[PDB]
DNA sequence: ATCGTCGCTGTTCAATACATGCACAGGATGTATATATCTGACACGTGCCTGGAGACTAGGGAGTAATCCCCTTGGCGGTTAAAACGCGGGGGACAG
């Protein structure tokens, strides 16, 4: 439903193949797992244990 | 005796000197700017030629319609795990 919502803002009356959604979910979770890995490394660098939004913002800024 | 005055002292009060917190001139070191000067890299002009333009053909790639059926959407209900809400406190964040 979320992907249909985001796509609805681009073009109306669209149908999705089930495999297309699964591929979007696979790449999305892999991106999010990789981001939290970089986020946890940033939080540990700040002598912390808890991840915080400033860690994600710094990580994505360095990533470009 | 009896009173007053003169040697011996402490205790407080005031005045002065010192120490600590704060701002404002004063210099010097760098930056910005003003100026003179000389330069070589850019812009133009010329001359020369290779790649773009023109004209035609042949041919297959793409556009077009007509049919197919596969895939996508959709609705429905049933247990069911996962989400959600709340509580309590501990250890992790954050500041000194």
């Amino acid at each position: 439903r979320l992907v249909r919502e985001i796509a609805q803002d681009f073009k109306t009356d669209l149908r999705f193949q089930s495999s297309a959604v699964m591929a979007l979910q696979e790449a999305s979770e892999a991106y999010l797992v990789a981001l939290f890995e970089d986020t946890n490394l940033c939080a540990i660098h700040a002598k912390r244990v808890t991840i915080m939004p400033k860690d994600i913002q710094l990580a994505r800024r360095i990533r470009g």
Side-chain angles (χ1 to χ4, degrees):
Chain A
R1 282 181 283 111
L2 178 60
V3 176
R4 291 185 186 275
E5 169 65 29
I6 298 169
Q8 188 60 250
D9 295 333
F10 289 101
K11 184 183 186 295
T12 62
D13 192 356
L14 290 176
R15 293 169 182 261
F16 293 15
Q17 290 180 353
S18 66
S19 62
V21 177
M22 301 305 291
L24 284 167
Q25 182 169 357
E26 192 53 350
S28 295
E29 292 188 356
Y31 171 76
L32 291 173
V33 171
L35 186 64
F36 288 4
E37 290 179 353
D38 297 332
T39 298
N40 205 168
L41 290 171
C42 294
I44 295 169
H45 181 75
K47 297 178 184 179
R48 296 174 185 173
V49 178
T50 307
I51 64 168
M52 287 182 181
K54 65 172 71 176
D55 294 330
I56 296 170
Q57 294 174 355
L58 180 67
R60 202 174 74 185
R61 278 287 296 267
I62 298 169
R63 183 72 73 86

